Amino acid sequence: DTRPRFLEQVKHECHFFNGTERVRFLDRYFYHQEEYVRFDSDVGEYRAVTELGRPSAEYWNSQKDLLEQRRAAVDTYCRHNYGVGESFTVQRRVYPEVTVYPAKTQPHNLLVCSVNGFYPGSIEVRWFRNGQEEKTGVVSTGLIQNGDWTFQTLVMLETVPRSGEVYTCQVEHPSLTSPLTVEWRA
Amino acid sequence: EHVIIQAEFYLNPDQSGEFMFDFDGDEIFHVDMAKKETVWRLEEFGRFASFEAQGALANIAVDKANLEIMTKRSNYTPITNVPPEVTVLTNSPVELREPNVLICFIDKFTPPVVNVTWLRNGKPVTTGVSETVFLPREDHLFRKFHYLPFLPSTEDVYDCRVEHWGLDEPLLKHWEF
């Protein structure tokens, strides 16, 4: 289909800093990708973001009842929903499964540390060779979202293994209380 | 530190709408517009929280009305198609004969309309596939996941085929053992 498309988007955003100590609410309106008007809880009124949003701001700012709804949002909406969902979202912890397998950059000179299934996203992966950290020659996929509330990442060490060498992939992650380490021997 | 977003959209002339909550970029739930039901992204979510799906339908009705208003305001300026970037990956390291999941990741595109087909040895597959709704991005494009559970063999090749009005021809992304 070649007919032109037109998209309206709205995003009501709750931003949380140190739990619910500092909360910021943004009521954001978009035409295609262009945000045209916004309510910011730091401001307490709608403000046009672009020319297209001026009529919106004036209209909604003339409605005192609407504005007072939005000014309480940090309490009645953001902090509220934070409390309802905190246990299965903020407190969700899924620890990583760690696999090490060899590979070849050219038809093994590549050690893959596959870190799978963890939540949340923040993770540190390090490579060791006979107890020494190996920082040169590391490439990674970066952080990958699986879309099912888990992450994965592959961290690859370029190296020429000599016999009698032990390589160690070490994984740190908030679900862990001490680093997770997997060895590979040549 | 943490961000919860209630994200809505409404698309003309397709008359497609969507309503969902997002936590740090993962979907908490969305509202099936046809069945008028809350669909939890993970089953366990629905046993600690509830959501009245009716109110979402009201928000989409306003979104539709506002889209009419903003369309006129823009002098009927339409969206510009942004084509997707597609990646195929596995859930976990691939072992022969041990079940796994192919993931087709469609990212950074708009409008939120896409045809996605899994092909095994060049033939469309249907059995056991699943997918997400359109997940919003911070640059206000979209992303989407498609899933195909499978048994890894040396016989089978797979491709994820993505069609989008921004592409001149379908995008195929390949995977094999």
Binding site: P55, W60, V84 | Q6, F51, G55, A58, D63, N66, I69
Partner: peptide
């Protein structure tokens, strides 16, 4: 137990 929505505003012509 209940997640709250946040109402979308009808704009003006």
């Amino acid at each position: 137990s209940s997640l709250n929505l946040r109402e979308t505003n009808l704009d003006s012509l």
